[PDB]
């Protein structure tokens, strides 16, 4: 229904806010008072309608068809969280198949050979979660990243991953905020956070920088560094610069960081990296300038764009076969569930706002 004025702020503070199509609205200033001040013309549904907030403001978490689909939602939502922070989320323990199911194998080929061809991340998640049941949150906002819940061996988990299908699974303002807030939610209530990575870098644009990407992008990292629940990270493909760092990397306190052979963990793109490392060796012999700049890029991506460099330093604890991702997360949470880790005493931290 209507949520106008300061009242809208109570829902902001709460955790998950559910909305219905044109049956409810949220706004501080009425659509009328807006015109008499700026002259802007907008209708309720457009100003603060469900579809608006579930994709433009990032204040809503779900858009249901009718009030029935909503009530059923919240119920599911509650089934993944504990009744309070003093306890782990509910559970319906059931041993998992320690062998490699025909579904598991399907992953061995999910990633195309083309470093430019996208694949649907949901598919990667549905293969690790029980009954391939994936309960997604804010599906319309910041599509470049997915955040939701599920169960592994009956115990609720939290999922954060990059969606190559959207904007090439890039990191930007809306994405950072989406995930960050989610991670801290899963942390506050002892829900582990599985994260699947594939990100090229941060979405370029003066608007980004000007809109404060520096102080809003950190949000994601702070969220991850601050967390203490079990943190398992899976690198499927892309892993470049700060983007790699940000996605629950081991340097942020992750517990188990897996990496598929189809992944490349490097400081920066091979295409752009060489334009700095060989800026000299390339200038020379203009004779076939781009036949050297191309030869290099090839030797780079063939030598550095992979997981093994990191795998040495220990940045990743292992380079697993795609089809073993599930067997990993399962046999990996069993250990981590007893993870005892704490932060320095403090009234509270000072996360960027």
């Amino acid at each position: 229904g209507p949520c106008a004025g300061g009242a809208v702020y109570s829902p902001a503070i709460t955790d998950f806010t559910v909305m219905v199509d044109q049956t409810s609205h949220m706004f501080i200033t009425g659509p009328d008072v807006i015109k008499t001040v700026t002259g802007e013309d907008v209708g309720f549904e457009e100003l603060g309608g469900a579809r608006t907030h579930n994709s433009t403001s990032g204040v809503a978490h779900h858009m249901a068809g009718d009030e029935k689909d909503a009530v059923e939602y919240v119920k599911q939502l509650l089934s993944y969280l504990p009744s309070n922070n003093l306890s782990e989320p509910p559970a319906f323990p059931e041993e998992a198949d320690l062998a490699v199911t025909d579904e598991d194998a399907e992953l061995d080929t999910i990633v195309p050979d083309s470093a430019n061809q996208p694949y649907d991340m949901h598919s990667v998640i549905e293969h690790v979660l029980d009954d391939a049941e994936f309960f997604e949150t804010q599906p319309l906002f910041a599509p470049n990243i997915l955040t939701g819940f599920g169960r592994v061996e009956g115990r609720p988990v939290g999922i954060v991953a990059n969606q190559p299908m959207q904007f090439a699974g890039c990191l930007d303002i809306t994405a950072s905020e989406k995930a960050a807030r989610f991670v801290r939610t899963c942390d506050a209530f002892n829900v582990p956070v599985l994260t699947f990575v594939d990100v090229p870098g941060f979405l370029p644009g003066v608007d980004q920088e000007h809109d404060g990407i520096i102080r809003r992008g950190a949000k994601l990292i702070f969220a991850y560094a601050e967390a203490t629940v079990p943190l398992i990270t899976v690198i499927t493909r892309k892993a470049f610069g700060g983007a790699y760092i940000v996605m629950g990397s081991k340097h942020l306190g992750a517990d188990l960081n897996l990496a598929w052979p189809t992944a490349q963990i490097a400081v920066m793109g091979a295409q752009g990296a060489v334009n700095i490392l060989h800026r000299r060796t390339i200038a020379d012999a203009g004779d076939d300038a781009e036949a050297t700049r191309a030869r290099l890029i090839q030797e780079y991506e063939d030598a550095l764009l992979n997981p093994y460099t990191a795998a040495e330093r220990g940045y990743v604890d292992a380079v697993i076969m795609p089809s073993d991702t599930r067997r990993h997360i399962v046999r990996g949470l069993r250990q981590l569930r007893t993870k005892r880790e704490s932060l320095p005493p403090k009234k509270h931290g000072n996360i960027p706002l």
């Binding site: 189809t262 063939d302 330093r313």
Partner: protein
Amino acid sequence: DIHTTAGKLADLRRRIEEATHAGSARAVEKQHAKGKLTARERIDLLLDEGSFVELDEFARHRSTNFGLDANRPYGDGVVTGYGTVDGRPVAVFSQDFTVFGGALGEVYGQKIVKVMDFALKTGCPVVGINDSGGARIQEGVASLGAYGEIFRRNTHASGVIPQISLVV
């Protein structure tokens, strides 16, 4: 190929191969000849069947001291990971004598640590299977630093998590 998803996988299989076979085909024979079992064989006999999950398997060192960079075996001398024992969680490192005499190195020690930090943070014992022939002299003080960070964990966790030493 190697630029395809099928080759990048096949490549891994290739690596997990020479990885579990870091030592020489002779070092193993010798090992067995003395009655001793290989490091990976000590882990299997200890942990519950199929419960062992290896950490830092494809890790290698970076010491160019005394041309050691010509021999950079995966694992760098020690097999560390976690697994269960009689249904209960356990962390374990197995020193591989068939690699550099099983001498403590930089990356060699870092692993033993990564495991002790994991065994403490998750509150599970730390079965340590030794065979170390001595400090990796080429790396100098780095090998001394490794022994330290370990001694410090031994203390900080003394009385906090069962720590058992297997000297074979």
